[PDB]
Enzyme design. Structure first.
Site, mmCIF file in Angstrom:
data_model
loop_
_atom_site.group_PDB
_atom_site.id
_atom_site.type_symbol
_atom_site.label_atom_id
_atom_site.label_comp_id
_atom_site.label_asym_id
_atom_site.label_seq_id
_atom_site.Cartn_x
_atom_site.Cartn_y
_atom_site.Cartn_z
ATOM 1 N N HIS A 202 0.880 -1.218 -0.073
ATOM 2 C CA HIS A 202 0.035 -0.134 -0.112
ATOM 3 C C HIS A 202 1.064 1.198 0.123
ATOM 4 O O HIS A 202 1.614 1.354 1.089
ATOM 5 C CB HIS A 202 -0.878 0.039 1.202
ATOM 6 C CG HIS A 202 -1.758 1.275 1.534
ATOM 7 N ND1 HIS A 202 -2.990 1.251 0.754
ATOM 8 C CD2 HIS A 202 -1.660 2.305 1.717
ATOM 9 C CE1 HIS A 202 -3.623 2.301 1.044
ATOM 10 N NE2 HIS A 202 -2.643 3.176 1.750
ATOM 11 N N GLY A 203 0.973 1.860 -1.043
ATOM 12 C CA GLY A 203 1.584 3.298 -1.194
ATOM 13 C C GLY A 203 0.517 4.358 -0.598
ATOM 14 O O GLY A 203 -0.487 4.356 -0.966
ATOM 15 N N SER A 204 1.344 5.459 -0.047
ATOM 16 C CA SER A 204 0.668 6.507 0.174
ATOM 17 C C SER A 204 1.553 7.944 0.179
ATOM 18 O O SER A 204 2.839 7.756 0.374
ATOM 19 C CB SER A 204 -0.266 6.610 1.646
ATOM 20 O OG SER A 204 -1.167 7.424 1.543
ATOM 21 N N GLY A 211 -0.665 9.699 10.105
ATOM 22 C CA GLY A 211 -1.768 9.145 10.551
ATOM 23 C C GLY A 211 -2.124 7.815 10.343
ATOM 24 O O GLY A 211 -2.830 7.150 10.988
ATOM 25 N N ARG A 218 -7.193 3.127 7.154
ATOM 26 C CA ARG A 218 -8.741 3.387 7.507
ATOM 27 C C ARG A 218 -9.596 3.396 6.153
ATOM 28 O O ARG A 218 -9.051 3.634 5.090
ATOM 29 C CB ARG A 218 -8.838 4.735 8.264
ATOM 30 C CG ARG A 218 -8.537 4.658 9.403
ATOM 31 C CD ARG A 218 -8.512 6.019 10.247
ATOM 32 N NE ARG A 218 -7.735 7.233 9.579
ATOM 33 C CZ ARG A 218 -7.912 8.426 10.040
ATOM 34 N NH1 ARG A 218 -8.446 8.901 11.166
ATOM 35 N NH2 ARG A 218 -7.296 9.378 9.130
ATOM 36 N N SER A 244 1.388 0.398 -6.378
ATOM 37 C CA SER A 244 1.336 0.780 -5.087
ATOM 38 C C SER A 244 2.228 2.161 -4.865
ATOM 39 O O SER A 244 2.126 3.276 -4.442
ATOM 40 C CB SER A 244 1.634 -0.099 -3.801
ATOM 41 O OG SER A 244 0.433 -0.768 -3.839
ATOM 42 N N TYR A 247 1.057 5.669 -5.986
ATOM 43 C CA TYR A 247 0.270 6.471 -5.175
ATOM 44 C C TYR A 247 1.136 7.387 -4.028
ATOM 45 O O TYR A 247 0.584 8.098 -3.094
ATOM 46 C CB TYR A 247 -0.547 5.590 -4.268
ATOM 47 C CG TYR A 247 -1.757 4.894 -5.347
ATOM 48 C CD1 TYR A 247 -2.621 5.939 -5.807
ATOM 49 C CD2 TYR A 247 -1.586 3.721 -5.705
ATOM 50 C CE1 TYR A 247 -3.521 5.438 -6.746
ATOM 51 C CE2 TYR A 247 -2.595 3.284 -6.790
ATOM 52 C CZ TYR A 247 -3.785 4.373 -7.122
ATOM 53 O OH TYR A 247 -4.842 3.961 -8.138
ATOM 54 N N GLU A 328 -5.805 -5.602 -7.765
ATOM 55 C CA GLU A 328 -5.977 -4.872 -6.674
ATOM 56 C C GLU A 328 -6.884 -5.916 -5.677
ATOM 57 O O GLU A 328 -7.635 -6.532 -6.023
ATOM 58 C CB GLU A 328 -6.825 -3.850 -7.445
ATOM 59 C CG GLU A 328 -6.830 -2.646 -7.092
ATOM 60 C CD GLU A 328 -7.571 -1.620 -7.861
ATOM 61 O OE1 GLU A 328 -8.508 -1.048 -7.302
ATOM 62 O OE2 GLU A 328 -6.799 -1.306 -8.766
HETATM 63 N N1 LIG Z 1 -2.522 2.684 -2.468
HETATM 64 C C1 LIG Z 1 -2.501 1.653 -2.975
HETATM 65 O O1 LIG Z 1 -1.245 1.048 -2.819
HETATM 66 C C2 LIG Z 1 -3.319 1.136 -3.959
HETATM 67 C C3 LIG Z 1 -3.006 0.059 -4.462
HETATM 68 C C4 LIG Z 1 -4.160 -0.720 -5.337
HETATM 69 C C5 LIG Z 1 -5.057 0.238 -5.758
HETATM 70 C C6 LIG Z 1 -5.329 1.393 -5.143
HETATM 71 N N2 LIG Z 1 -6.327 2.236 -5.791
HETATM 72 C C7 LIG Z 1 -6.050 3.192 -5.083
HETATM 73 C C8 LIG Z 1 -6.782 4.364 -4.714
HETATM 74 O O2 LIG Z 1 -7.930 4.735 -5.037
HETATM 75 N N3 LIG Z 1 -6.284 5.613 -3.573
HETATM 76 C C9 LIG Z 1 -5.211 6.234 -3.086
HETATM 77 C C10 LIG Z 1 -5.381 7.704 -3.253
HETATM 78 C C11 LIG Z 1 -6.756 7.440 -2.499
HETATM 79 N N4 LIG Z 1 -7.624 8.822 -1.997
HETATM 80 C C12 LIG Z 1 -7.537 6.693 -3.445
HETATM 81 N N5 LIG Z 1 -4.968 3.284 -3.994
HETATM 82 C C13 LIG Z 1 -4.496 1.783 -4.336
#
Ligand SMILES: NC(=O)c1cccc2[nH]c(C(=O)N3CC[C@@H](N)C3)nc12
Length: 351
Positions: A202-204, A211, A218, A244, A247, A328
């Site tokens: 999970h990337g962010s 948080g 969350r 990931s 993101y 996903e």
């Molecule tokens: N964050 C992830 O690593 C990830 C992995 C596979 C599909 C995803 N789809 C999304 C995504 O819809 N996101 C991250 C920004 C959030 N506000 C929406 N994040 C992912």
């Protein structure tokens, strides 16, 4: 101060995730007016009210015109001031506008948490503020030794799962941290023996990590527009590192990012090919799998502390007419995730 005894990589992590200027930079990246909505004035109730107005904008777009939308779009801008000078801001009138603003609100929710931690609590100049801020994460963070078994498996996962269609950059693993958020282990207990547990990415953005470590991953709140997320309001994961890594939202102006590996209890997967903005799973399902055209080769799965790691190189899944190039995974109960590692990555952009 005493000066922190934490290892240098842990200290640098704490510095990055609590950087107030990075928080401000992200808000300017979102077109927010910092004179009207400075960092210190963000509040849960204002973000929540914004989410609701965006849900109204969603409802107007589902049922179709620019005149009737205008009022709603304006209401969103009223609650979250955008820096448009003497203006007319852009009309928020489609699905893309709704996903982009819901994403922004998700990020503001995490920035608000990080700042509240900074402002909540005590001031003691004989303590190293790095130590002080580490304690607010209520998470044990250890450096994984580059020579261990678990380091070798993680590095292979990163080496093998970089998609060809994401080849504008590559990735160097800088530090690997092993993380234990307090209470999370207890929360995950009902799921600890579930079938189809997998170690996923999970990337962010780095501004979200105070948080995430303090509150965990969350789900978007009830006010948030379900239609802002491809498979609705769940927690999203990938089995390809680059999917990931995208993101993290790194760039040439900030090429260092953070990614998580979580143990995710997927159980009985609800398999889907296209957007499905669900509110609940069907009875008997524990997760969604967004079916990629490409998957890590199933025959190269390896075990790490009993959890499957899908670290094979990408092969055809055999799935035909799917909206997704890669897999996903979505869960809809926060308790189905046990975060295990955090990687600091450097992004070498080739462009
Ligand atoms: N964050 C992830 O690593 C990830 C992995 C596979 C599909 C995803 N789809 C999304 C995504 O819809 N996101 C991250 C920004 C959030 N506000 C929406 N994040 C992912």
């Amino acid at each position: 101060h005493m000066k922190s005894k934490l290892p240098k990589p842990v200290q640098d992590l704490i510095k990055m995730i609590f950087d107030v200027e990075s928080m401000k930079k992200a808000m300017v990246e979102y077109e927010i007016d910092l004179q009207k909505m400075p960092l210190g004035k963000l509040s849960k109730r204002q973000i929540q009210a914004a989410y609701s107005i965006l849900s109204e904008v969603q409802q107007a777009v589902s049922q179709g015109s620019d005149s009737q939308i205008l009022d709603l779009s304006n209401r969103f801008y009223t609650l979250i001031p955008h820096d448009f000078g003497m203006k007319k801001p852009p009309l928020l009138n489609n699905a893309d506008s709704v996903q982009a603003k819901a994403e922004m609100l998700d990020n503001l929710l995490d920035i608000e948490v990080a700042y509240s931690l900074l402002r909540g609590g005590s001031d003691d100049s004989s303590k190293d503020p790095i130590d002080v801020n580490y304690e607010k994460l209520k998470t044990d963070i250890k450096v994984v030794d580059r020579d261990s078994e678990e380091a070798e498996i993680i590095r292979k996962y990163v080496k093998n799962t970089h998609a060809t269609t994401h080849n504008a950059y590559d990735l160097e693993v800088i530090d690997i941290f092993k993380i234990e958020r307090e209470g999370e282990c207890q929360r995950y207990k009902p799921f600890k023996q579930l079938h189809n547990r997998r170690l996923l990415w999970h990337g962010s953005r780095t501004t979200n990590f105070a948080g995430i470590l303090s509150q965990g991953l969350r789900i978007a709140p009830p006010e948030a527009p379900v239609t802002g997320y491809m498979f609705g309001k769940g927690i999203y994961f990938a089995d390809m590192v680059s999917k990931s890594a995208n993101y993290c939202h790194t760039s040439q102006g900030d090429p260092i990012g953070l990614i998580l590996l979580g143990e995710v209890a997927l159980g009985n997967m609800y398999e889907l090919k296209h957007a499905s903005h669900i509110s609940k799973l069907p009875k008997g399902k524990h997760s969604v799998k967004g079916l990629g055209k490409t998957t890590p080769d199933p025959s190269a799965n390896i075990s790490l502390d009993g959890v499957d790691v899908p670290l094979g190189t990408g092969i055809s899944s055999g799935v035909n007419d799917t909206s997704l190039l890669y897999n996903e995974y979505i869960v809809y109960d926060i308790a189905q995730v046990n975060l295990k590692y955090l990687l600091k990555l450097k992004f070498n952009f080739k462009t």
